Chain A
Amino acid sequence: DIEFINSLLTIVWRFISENTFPNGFKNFENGPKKNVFYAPNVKNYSTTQEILEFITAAQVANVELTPSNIRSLCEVLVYDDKLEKVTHDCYRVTLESILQMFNYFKMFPASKHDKEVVYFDEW
């Protein structure tokens, strides 16, 4: 509790996003994701103890050497609300990468004699 959990969450999501897709074709759509993977291959892999290697490569010197319980807890934490979760932690896709950059809802609300908040009211 409470901020280092979010920091570890951010860095493991960054490691998943850089393990699946390359980083240089994330900020723009210049032939997206290298025309994604150049008609993708049969690679279909993930970390499988590589995530704990990336954990062990950079830690705080506290007692956070957790593994096999908080590992699965953070895994559930990124599938009790969120992205892919297919056949025991494969490729993690679906809309978080463009959410870090339902899309493009600038300039809400208005403050006139008119609409918003008019919604969710009891009823």
Chain B
Amino acid sequence: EFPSIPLPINGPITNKERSLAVKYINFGKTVKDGPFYTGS
């Protein structure tokens, strides 16, 4: 597309931070499951 000027260094898949994303999504699921939802 239009952005072609170069990219930063925070994009490999050599991460070893797979536990942090699991903690993130489990926190998100426990907050979404909670009583203080008030959606739509």
Interface residues of A (CB under 8 A from B): 102, 104-110, 115-121
B8 within 8 A of A: yes
Instruction: Flag if A121 contacts B12 (CB, 8 Å).
Output: no
Shortest distance from the beta carbon of A111 to any chain B beta carbon, whole Å: 12
Q: How far is the CA of A110 from the CA of B7 in the complex (A)?
A: 11
Contact partner, B7, options A102, A104, A107, A108, Cβ 8 Å: A108
Interface residues of B (CB under 8 A from A): 2-9, 11-14
* Residues of the A chain whose Cβ atoms lie less than 8 Å from the Cβ of B9: 102, 105, 108
Instruction: Flag if A107 contacts B12 (CB, 8 Å).
Output: yes
Instruction: Flag if B3 contacts A117 (CB, 8 Å).
Output: yes
Instruction: Flag if B11 contacts A121 (CB, 8 Å).
Output: no
* Residues of the B chain whose Cβ atoms lie less than 8 Å from the Cβ of A107: 12-14
